[PDB]
Enzyme design. Structure first.
Site, mmCIF file in Angstrom:
data_model
loop_
_atom_site.group_PDB
_atom_site.id
_atom_site.type_symbol
_atom_site.label_atom_id
_atom_site.label_comp_id
_atom_site.label_asym_id
_atom_site.label_seq_id
_atom_site.Cartn_x
_atom_site.Cartn_y
_atom_site.Cartn_z
ATOM 1 N N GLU A 157 45.422 21.961 102.714
ATOM 2 C CA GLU A 157 44.279 21.557 103.538
ATOM 3 C C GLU A 157 44.713 20.552 104.592
ATOM 4 O O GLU A 157 44.471 19.356 104.449
ATOM 5 C CB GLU A 157 43.183 20.910 102.687
ATOM 6 C CG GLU A 157 42.050 21.834 102.307
ATOM 7 C CD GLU A 157 41.262 22.346 103.504
ATOM 8 O OE1 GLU A 157 40.292 21.679 103.915
ATOM 9 O OE2 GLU A 157 41.620 23.419 104.037
ATOM 10 N N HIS A 165 36.322 32.390 102.944
ATOM 11 C CA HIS A 165 36.255 31.325 101.954
ATOM 12 C C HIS A 165 35.955 31.793 100.536
ATOM 13 O O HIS A 165 34.850 32.251 100.245
ATOM 14 C CB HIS A 165 35.193 30.306 102.382
ATOM 15 C CG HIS A 165 35.194 29.048 101.571
ATOM 16 N ND1 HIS A 165 34.035 28.448 101.125
ATOM 17 C CD2 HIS A 165 36.212 28.269 101.135
ATOM 18 C CE1 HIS A 165 34.340 27.356 100.446
ATOM 19 N NE2 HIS A 165 35.656 27.224 100.436
HETATM 20 N N1 LIG Z 1 39.835 22.893 95.091
HETATM 21 C C1 LIG Z 1 40.266 24.169 95.189
HETATM 22 O O1 LIG Z 1 40.961 24.715 94.350
HETATM 23 C C2 LIG Z 1 39.819 24.958 96.488
HETATM 24 C C3 LIG Z 1 38.488 25.520 96.498
HETATM 25 C C4 LIG Z 1 38.165 26.212 97.700
HETATM 26 C C5 LIG Z 1 38.970 26.389 98.811
HETATM 27 N N2 LIG Z 1 40.272 25.799 98.712
HETATM 28 C C6 LIG Z 1 41.196 25.942 99.869
HETATM 29 O O2 LIG Z 1 42.438 26.550 99.542
HETATM 30 C C7 LIG Z 1 43.517 25.970 100.352
HETATM 31 C C8 LIG Z 1 44.559 25.341 99.448
HETATM 32 O O3 LIG Z 1 44.914 26.215 98.387
HETATM 33 P P1 LIG Z 1 45.406 25.645 96.982
HETATM 34 O O4 LIG Z 1 44.225 25.097 96.261
HETATM 35 O O5 LIG Z 1 46.130 26.751 96.301
HETATM 36 O O6 LIG Z 1 46.413 24.401 97.227
HETATM 37 P P2 LIG Z 1 47.927 24.392 96.680
HETATM 38 O O7 LIG Z 1 48.594 23.156 97.182
HETATM 39 O O8 LIG Z 1 47.885 24.540 95.202
HETATM 40 O O9 LIG Z 1 48.713 25.637 97.297
HETATM 41 C C9 LIG Z 1 49.442 25.547 98.521
HETATM 42 C C10 LIG Z 1 50.526 26.591 98.508
HETATM 43 O O10 LIG Z 1 50.831 26.979 99.882
HETATM 44 C C11 LIG Z 1 52.231 26.943 100.073
HETATM 45 N N3 LIG Z 1 52.506 26.715 101.500
HETATM 46 C C12 LIG Z 1 52.536 25.528 102.200
HETATM 47 N N4 LIG Z 1 52.815 25.666 103.474
HETATM 48 C C13 LIG Z 1 52.984 27.031 103.631
HETATM 49 C C14 LIG Z 1 53.302 27.854 104.760
HETATM 50 N N5 LIG Z 1 53.512 27.369 105.985
HETATM 51 N N6 LIG Z 1 53.397 29.219 104.578
HETATM 52 C C15 LIG Z 1 53.185 29.725 103.336
HETATM 53 N N7 LIG Z 1 52.881 29.048 102.201
HETATM 54 C C16 LIG Z 1 52.793 27.695 102.421
HETATM 55 C C17 LIG Z 1 52.699 25.803 99.173
HETATM 56 O O11 LIG Z 1 54.090 25.885 98.937
HETATM 57 C C18 LIG Z 1 51.849 26.076 97.931
HETATM 58 O O12 LIG Z 1 52.450 27.052 97.091
HETATM 59 C C19 LIG Z 1 42.836 24.938 101.236
HETATM 60 O O13 LIG Z 1 42.535 25.484 102.519
HETATM 61 C C20 LIG Z 1 41.577 24.578 100.442
HETATM 62 O O14 LIG Z 1 40.540 24.054 101.241
HETATM 63 C C21 LIG Z 1 40.678 25.101 97.571
#
Ligand SMILES: NC(=O)c1ccc[n+]([C@@H]2O[C@H](COP(=O)([O-])OP(=O)(O)OC[C@H]3O[C@@H](n4cnc5c(N)ncnc54)[C@H](O)[C@@H]3O)[C@@H](O)[C@H]2O)c1
Ligand SMILES: NC(=O)c1ccc[n+]([C@@H]2O[C@H](COP(=O)([O-])OP(=O)(O)OC[C@H]3O[C@@H](n4cnc5c(N)ncnc54)[C@H](O)[C@@H]3O)[C@@H](O)[C@H]2O)c1
Ligand SMILES: CCCCCCCCOCCOCCOCCOCCOCCO
Ligand SMILES: CCCCCCCCOCCOCCOCCOCCOCCO
Ligand SMILES: [Zn+2]
Lengths: 708, 238
Positions: free
Chosen positions: B164, B212
């Site tokens: 994020e 989303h």
């Molecule tokens: N709280 C939640 O679980 C939740 C709920 C709804 C929406 N989201 C959204 O999901 C997104 C985050 O996902 P997450 O919860 O899995 O976080 P996370 O940190 O667990 O996952 C991030 C992953 O993306 C990878 N990454 C980073 N930069 C990258 C790039 N340039 N190319 C490819 N991969 C890359 C990282 O290595 C990691 O594996 C955000 O946009 C967040 O708003 C999260």
């Protein structure tokens, strides 16, 4: 201490309890060599003389409990005359029996591996406590023999005939869990409590809580089984073991015959029956050839260590081309803990590859041989693709594309510009020159051949081919990777047919000469199957495919015109031209619906039968075997393979050479070099394939042999 | 049993039982009367018309569904940027429903977590007889791990599920855009960032929207397709 030797010690503990510990000083393991046996004699006599002893705990000071003696001593011992061998075993068994007759409770604390003599020592005690991580078993049959220190006597009286037979005829290692279920052992505990469990158990025996005398009794008397139940048990055992081990493996059935003959006997007589059968087996040609295989393996393992000194572990692999070999390679790699990229040119290609990897994985889970979670790990290990985007960190790439020099040289050259310049490249080709393919590359030092056999997940052998430019590092890394994939790699210098195929065709040539001579092919492979071959020539040719054999022949003929080029059409030509391509095609020498004899072939082969030469089964074997053995000798002499062990194991793993015959070169040793050369000359009329070599004739006279 | 499972706020289930219990010793006609009385009662409850209203809502959504489908381009090949919680969850879902998907990340560790979770779920179902071992194979083979854009060439829709961070997302989004067809749809799974903001880093914002999902992706029914100021009807419909 009560007794202090260099292999065994007897230290006094609390309440009169004494501990006899095995710890062969200076060595990595405990084993019943001459020294240890002698010390056990002394340790037993010392305990037998110390009237203050109230119980004995037998433990180990190494990571293992007790394993077998050095294969070396097995070889020596089995050279002795039957009378001496048997007398020596009578003496050894006397030690174990005396330990078993101690008028005091005894417990064996199995901390680690206890194989053969090691287990036999345990069976001699009243109780056995085992660490949950240990394993026990009697691998004697692997050497063409069977338990010689009371194993066939004690195991059956302890866990029952059926189970004893299963352990002895298979020689499998058994986990703590299973050992407890058949009562080979009495308790299973963690490694940290082994000592306390043994000490606790012994005290309960001493207090009378556990009747150690009653627990010992069963191995001092006849089996509990009825004459009727005995017949049922032994006859079915023989029947089942017979159709599974084959007529060429005496050991398994003899063990059963020994237990059957001793069924109504106590210890001493049963030991006699055991000793006699043991002596008999130790002298069989099957035994020393099996033991020779073991010696070969030891040699290979020493070369393994040398390769590993420089071999770079393959963390990330890649295979070009999915399908039969490609998909098979991917499956294997992923199945053994090595992530692999499956590259192809079209989605359909990747489909087949993934499809097959699935059928296998699913097949194992559908038979409780594999965890659903494990199947997941494997599949995630295979990564399909149609680009080189992820090849950046690949350590070794295996090319398994169509059998076309043009195609391979193009692909190989292409991938080279997508991997690190220190990445190893290998071709799975079976009929193209590695040194030829290497010329299309800018870094040939990193190119070798990694030859697998269909079906990749089944065939044990992998021929690592060294091209003229192939570096030791490239070869070493490929070797180690093959071993990691669960295969048995053997290095072979580039040459037409490498080691396996190059040896098989002279074999098929002889088969071709027999058929052209009017000899019935159904009789032929029935004879070669009796000889020990899994499949006969004709049938094998079908399984491999006549089209495949046709192509192969052409390659070899070009490769070695002086002996593999035949100026007459053979049965291969007749079947190929007649479109009888083999098992896959539905028709070859046989007809497949599965394997059937169909006279419609007679017509096809008729034009090939030149003379109607009469032959004996013994000639058939020689027409087949002499070419195969001599070609192996040529490979050794040409340096295609460095040692005889490598050449023989190459055939044992890649051709299914009869194990009880040790290999092509060891077969010549069995017959006798001089005798073999003489034999070969007798068929000198058949061609250059039957002509001994100067080096061979030479060693034939100097009393030299390949392994002797 | 029904009580502690439906809740006190759902009369229907318990009433049906009460009706069968009241008619237990009756023949057809009398049993029908008991049924009719309970039916009339339920048909007038607030729970009932609110439940029926949900049904009417669904109908409305299905009519809009047909309109979207008139232009929506089927997604034969999908891709998700980032493994882990959301990324891996999205991969699993896509593959589980018959749509091959590329799982892109920046380090092996990231792909591990993604594949690990996709496995636990698939294995969990097979370990419960709810799924065939052969089916689990199809799903896993559907997920294709990677660390490059070499196979993005034929991706129809890419879902960005990276950290994020506006700066990070704008960089990645702009990057992937140069590795997919110019008619490929790009989407961000962001929950607190502006879709219209992220779209300004792109040269083809008309193809950018928000997709989303909610944690855990395989559990939550809702997906908010966000239309940015530049988002085309095709991008949204797809
Ligand atoms: N709280 C939640 O679980 C939740 C709920 C709804 C929406 N989201 C959204 O999901 C997104 C985050 O996902 P997450 O919860 O899995 O976080 P996370 O940190 O667990 O996952 C991030 C992953 O993306 C990878 N990454 C980073 N930069 C990258 C790039 N340039 N190319 C490819 N991969 C890359 C990282 O290595 C990691 O594996 C955000 O946009 C967040 O708003 C999260
Ligand atoms: N009898 C056997 O099966 C056997 C035994 C030993 C060794 N080999 C060797 O294996 C190779 C052939 O393997 P196969 O029998 O599985 O053939 P195959 O036809 O079954 O599979 C070939 C696969 O490679 C793909 N391919 C073609 N060109 C490609 C390229 N440029 N890049 C990537 N992928 C490409 C094809 O699409 C196809 O999926 C040969 O070198 C052969 O000598 C075969
Ligand atoms: C008594 C029953 C035996 C059962 C039969 C199984 C065979 C087990 O015997 C194994 C003996 O192996 C002999 C090899 O010894 C040579 C030592 O190799 C040198 C390399 O050193 C590496 C040590 O890890
Ligand atoms: C022209 C194509 C070439 C085809 C060649 C393949 C035909 C061979 O088929 C026979 C199957 O091979 C069986 C391998 O046997 C396994 C060896 O057993 C291992 C025991 O080794 C003892 C180690 O101590
Ligand atoms: Zn021809």
């Amino acid at each position: 201490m009560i007794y202090e030797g260099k292999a065994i010690t007897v230290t006094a503990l609390e309440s009169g309890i004494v501990e006899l510990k095995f710890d062969l000083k200076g060595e990595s393991v405990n084993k019943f060599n001459r020294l240890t046996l002698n010390e056990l004699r002394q340790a037993v006599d010392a305990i037998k003389a110390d009237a203050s002893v109230k119980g004995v705990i037998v433990s180990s000071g190494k990571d293992v409990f007790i394993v077998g003696a050095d294969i070396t001593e097995f070889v020596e011992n089995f050279k002795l005359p039957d009378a001496e061998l048997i007398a020596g075993n009578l003496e050894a068994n006397k030690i174990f029996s005396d330990f078993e007759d101690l008028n005091v409770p005894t417990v064996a604390a199995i901390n680690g591996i206890a194989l053969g003599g090691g287990l036999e020592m345990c069976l001699a005690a009243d109780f056995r406590v085992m660490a949950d991580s240990a394993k026990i078993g009697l691998p004697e049959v692997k050497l063409g023999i069977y338990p010689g220190f009371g194993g066939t006597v004690r195991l059956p009286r302890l866990i029952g005939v059926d189970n004893a037979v299963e352990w002895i005829a298979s020689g499998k290692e058994n986990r703590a869990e299973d050992a407890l279920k058949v009562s080979a052992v009495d308790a299973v505990v963690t490694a940290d409590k082994l000592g306390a469990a043994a000490l606790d158990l012994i005290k309960r025996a001493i207090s009378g809580e556990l009747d150690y005398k009653a627990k010992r009794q069963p191995k001092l008397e006849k089996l509990k089984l009825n004459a009727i139940e005995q017949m049922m048990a032994f006859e079915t055992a023989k029947g089942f073991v017979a159709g599974q081990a084959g007529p060429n493996y005496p050991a398994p059935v003899e063990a059963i015959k020994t237990i059957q003959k001793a069924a109504n006997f106590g210890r001493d007589k049963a030991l006699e029956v055991e000793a006699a059968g043991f002596a008999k087996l130790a002298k069989t040609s099957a035994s020393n050839c099996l033991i020779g295989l073991f010696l070969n393996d030891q040699e290979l393992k020493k070369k393994a260590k040398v390769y590993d000194k420089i071999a770079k572990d393959v963390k990330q692999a890649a295979v070009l081309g999915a399908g039969i070999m490609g998909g098979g390679i991917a499956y294997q790699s992923a199945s053994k803990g090595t992530p692999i990229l499956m590259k192809d040119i079209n989605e359909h290609g990747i489909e087949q590859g993934l499809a097959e990897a699935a059928k296998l994985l699913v097949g194992r889970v559908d038979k409780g041989r594999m965890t659903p979670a494990k199947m997941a790990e494997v599949l995630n290990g295979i990564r399909p693709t149609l680009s080189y985007g992820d090849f950046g960190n690949v350590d070794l790439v295996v090319e398994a594309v169509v059998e076309n020099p043009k195609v391979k040289q193009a692909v190989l050259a292409e991938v080279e510009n997508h991997v690190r310049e220190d990445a190893i490249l290998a071709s799975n080709t079976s009929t193209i020159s590695i040194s030829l393919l290497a010329k299309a590359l800018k870094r040939p030092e990193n190119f070798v051949g990694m030859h697998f056999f269909n079906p990749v997940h089944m065939m044990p052998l992998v021929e690592v081919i060294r091209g003229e430019k192939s570096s030791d590092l490239a070869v070493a890394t490929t070797v180690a990777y093959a071993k990691k994939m669960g295969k048995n790699p053997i290095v072979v210098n580039d040459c037409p047919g490498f080691l396996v195929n190059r040896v098989l065709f002279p074999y098929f040539g002889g088969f071709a000469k027999l058929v052209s001579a009017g000899v019935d092919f159904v009789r032929i492979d029935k004879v070669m199957e009796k000889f020990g071959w899994p499949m006969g020539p004709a049938y094998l040719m079908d399984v491999v495919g006549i089209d495949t054999g046709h192509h192969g022949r052409d390659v070899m003929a070009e490769g070695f015109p002086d002996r593999m080029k035949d100026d007459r059409r053979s049965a291969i030509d007749a079947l190929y031209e007649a479109k009888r391509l083999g098992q896959k095609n539905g028709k070859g020498f046989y007809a497949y619906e599965k394997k059937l004899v169909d006279s419609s072939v007679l017509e096809v082969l008729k034009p090939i039968v030149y003379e109607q030469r009469d032959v004996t089964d013994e000639d058939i074997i020689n027409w087949m075997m002499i070419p195969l053995c001599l070609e192996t000798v040529r490979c050794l002499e040409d340096g295609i393979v460095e040692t005889a062990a490598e050449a023989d194991m190459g055939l044992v793993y890649g051709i299914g050479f009869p194990l009880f015959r040790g290999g092509a070169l060891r077969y010549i040793d069995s017959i006798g070099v001089a005798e073999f050369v003489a034999l070969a000359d007798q068929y000198a009329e058949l061609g250059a394939l039957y002509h001994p070599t100067a080096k061979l004739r030479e060693m034939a006279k100097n009393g030299q042999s390949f392994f002797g």
